Write a protein that holds these residues in place. Structure first.
Motif, PDB file in Angstrom:
ATOM      1  N   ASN A 173      31.653  37.827  43.912  1.00 47.06           N
ATOM      2  CA  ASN A 173      33.402  37.405  42.520  1.00 47.06           C
ATOM      3  C   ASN A 173      34.580  36.929  43.530  1.00 47.06           C
ATOM      4  N   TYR A 198      36.599  34.611  41.592  1.00 44.51           N
ATOM      5  CA  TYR A 198      38.090  35.328  41.342  1.00 44.51           C
ATOM      6  C   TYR A 198      39.148  35.570  42.104  1.00 44.51           C
ATOM      7  N   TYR A 205      36.520  28.936  37.571  1.00 39.27           N
ATOM      8  CA  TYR A 205      38.073  29.256  37.816  1.00 39.27           C
ATOM      9  C   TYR A 205      38.549  27.495  38.487  1.00 39.27           C
TER      10      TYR A 205
END
Length: 209
Positions: free
Chosen positions: A74, A77, A115
């Motif tokens: 992740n 992120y 994103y």
């Protein structure tokens, strides 16, 4: 009861009760800082500090996560969040430079991240902001007749922020600074750059590498 505390914190985050969610998440991170769920707790704390406008705490928590888990699934992120936090600290372009670096590091690591699209949108604004600042500096140098410093600032704008309004406005400062130095090959190059820079910005979001 860490599992029920965690479920509770998750609901507080969903309510937008940042303060209570931060409390319960910090107590979990206190108690099990290298536990099986600690990365989960830390990601949620990153988010909660950001949403609560605790930006220095968000920034520190992001830096620690990146140092301790450099290859985490992740990470995309976490670097989105680092860009958002630095961008919030910007609202002296230091924070804008940090956000530009964060988001550009994101887009060049995970061109397929969820994103992606928001980071690229924010990068337009950042590049605009940073180029405006560099243009102000090039103008100041012009006022001084510091022709070499003018050429340095503008070439940095052209290299890094080529499609912005400020780089447009600054190219004639650079052509001028070379002319002031009798530097004809260089000056004619800039004149070429100026004639050719269309307002038509190119799109390559549909290309995959």
């Amino acid at each position: 009861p860490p599992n029920e505390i965690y479920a509770t914190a998750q609901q507080k985050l969903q309510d937008g009760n940042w303060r209570q969610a931060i409390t319960q998440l910090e107590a979990l991170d206190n108690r099990y800082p290298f536990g099986p769920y600690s990365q989960q707790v830390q990601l949620d704390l990153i988010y909660a500090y950001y949403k609560n406008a605790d930006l220095p705490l968000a920034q520190a928590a992001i830096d620690r996560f990146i140092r301790l888990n450099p290859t985490h699934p992740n990470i995309d992120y976490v670097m989105y969040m680092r860009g958002l936090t630095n961008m919030a600290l910007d609202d002296d372009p230091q924070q804008a430079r940090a956000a530009f670096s964060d988001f550009s590091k994101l887009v060049r690591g995970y061109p397929n991240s969820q994103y992606t699209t928001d980071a690229t949108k924010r990068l337009v604004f950042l590049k605009d902001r940073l180029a405006k600042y560099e243009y102000s500096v090039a103008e100041y140098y012009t006022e001084r007749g510091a022709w070499v410093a003018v050429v340095n600032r503008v070439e940095g704008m052209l290299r890094d922020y080529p499609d912005t309004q400020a780089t447009r406005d600054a190219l004639p400062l650079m052509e001028n600074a070379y002319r002031q130095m009798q530097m004809n090959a260089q000056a004619e190059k800039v004149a070429k750059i100026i004639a050719a820079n269309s307002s038509n910005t190119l799109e390559h979001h549909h290309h995959h590498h």
